[PDB]
Structure 1
Amino acid sequence: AAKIEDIVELPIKGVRAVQSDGQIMFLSENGRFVISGQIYDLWSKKPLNTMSQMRDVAERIHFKSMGMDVDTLNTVSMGRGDKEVVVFVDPRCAVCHQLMGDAKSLVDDYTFKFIVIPALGAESNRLAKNLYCAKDKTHALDALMNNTLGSLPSKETCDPGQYDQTLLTAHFIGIEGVPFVVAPDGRVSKGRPKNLKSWLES
């Protein structure tokens, strides 16, 4: 337990990994600062040594490698396929509803984890709570998909705060917007894929 003697917030709003002359350096967004050295992904517990690895953290999210179990979040599952797809959705998000529709034709190859987050506020919170508190989750999936979550029978003792953990977690780990799809190989789609089936195969 080494103590931190001092901490200073630097005027850096962004960082690029830049490869040149057998080295990878870290250059700030307005180009004021360059850092020479080694970067370590504390969440996945590994050094990033190659540009493929830099590309990987920009492009992919590996929940298991980072020790994040999505089933512990406000999650409903659809399908029984051997490859797992993650989708962050708002209960009121129509594009999300459409995505969940396209996914029904894919349940033989994939198991979709729909992570419900009240990204759109107000009524979305009330809905996400109804999902989180529903007694019989076997009907949660259908209610989420039909925007009928409001009617779901609640557990007697279930009253979360307004700051939804799944939302906080998503915000924290860098999930932006809904729907947000993470393919089995970790590739992220910020929005609904043009064609879900093809996008999913790699």
Structure 2
Amino acid sequence: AKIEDIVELPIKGVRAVQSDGQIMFLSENGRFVISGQIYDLWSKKPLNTMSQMRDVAERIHFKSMGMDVDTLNTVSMGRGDKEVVVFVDPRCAVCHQLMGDAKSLVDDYTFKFIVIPALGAESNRLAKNLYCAKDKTHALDALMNNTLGSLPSGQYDQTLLTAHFIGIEGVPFVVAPDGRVSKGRPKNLKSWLESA
């Protein structure tokens, strides 16, 4: 069954508002109100409570959205049964520092470092090399030391394109085991992973 007609509306943000039991959707500047029901098509679920609303604003649940992060330009570090996802650029020094902090935590977490060239054509180069690594154990090591170009083996990186599509902004971008997101490096990684 088809979409027959499409019109872009002058709407740049939407807020869910709850009053006396009913949840409505207001455009960010107060021009439009939509009375009805919102559905998360990627998670294939209706959002019916303010708690579910907050979940999609504050959290990312990759497997729930049909995303396997191991299929991206991803390298893994650690042994924990709690998964931590960190989008990183190969030239990002705060990303490198964050990755250094994660080394002390490898017993309780498994880190998924997803390499994205968010910072340019040279970042593309390094990310592109890592993608073609013979041995991703060394790739991991290469990533953390900023030694990626001398790695044994498109201008438009798929991991970059995907992150952008789904709204990942800036690096580093961290997703805790419970889905909580950190736009940037948290003050204390260990504490942040434990709880809000």
Interval containing the TM-score (normalised by the shorter chain): over 0.9
Unaligned runs of 5+ in 2: none
Cα distance, 1:131 vs. partner? Answer: 0.2
Aligned to 1:195: 188
Distance in 2 separating the partners of 1:33 and 1:114: 40
1:51 Cα deviation after fit: 0.3
Superposed CA offset, 1:63-86 (max 9, x none):
011110000000000111110000
3-state SS of 2:110 partner: strand
Q: Deviation at 1:22?
A: 0.9
Deviation at 1:193, TM superposition (A): 0.5
Q: Provide the C-alpha distance between the structure 1 equivalents of 2:110 and 2:67, rounded to a whole number of angstroms.
A: 17
Distance in 1 (CA, whole Å) between partners of 2:18 and 2:178 is 25
SS of 2:67's partner is: coil
State the SS of the aligned residue for 2:112. strand
Measured after TM superposition, the shift of residue 4 of structure 1 is 1.5
CA distance in 2, matches of 1:187, 1:112: 15
Deviations 1:106-141 (A, max 9, x none): 000000000000000121000001100111112001
Q: TM-score of the superposition, structure 1-length normalised?
A: 0.96
Q: Deviations over 1:170-197 (max 9, x none)?
A: 0011100000000000000000000000
Q: How many residues align?
A: 195
Equivalent position SS for 2:94: helix
| Matched position secondary structure for 2:54 | helix
* Partner Cα distance (1:121, 1:199) in 2: 29
Quick one: distance in 2 between partners of 1:3 and 1:74?
Answer: 35
Q: Which runs of 4+ in 1 moved over 2 A?
A: none
Instruction: Provide the C-alpha distance between the structure 2 equivalents of 1:91 and 1:199, rounded to a whole number of angstroms.
Output: 23
SS in 2 for 1:192: coil
TM-score (norm. length: structure 2) = 0.98
Q: Kindly, what percent of the aligned residue pairs are identical? A: 100
What is the alpha-carbon distance in structure 2 between the residues aligned to residue 138 and residue 199 of structure 1? 27
Distance 1:194 1:185 in 2: 18
- The Cα offsets for residues 38-70 of structure 1, whole Å up to 9 and x where unpaired, read as 000000000000000000000000001111000
Partners of 1:43 and 1:25 in 2: how far apart?
21
The aligned runs of 1:39-188 (5 Å cut-off) are 39-154=38-153, 161-188=154-181
When the two chains are superposed, the root-mean-square deviation of aligned CA atoms in Å is 0.6
How far, CA to CA, are the matches of 2:3 and 2:127 in structure 1?
Answer: 39
SS at match of 1:4: coil
Gaps of 5+ in 1: 155-160
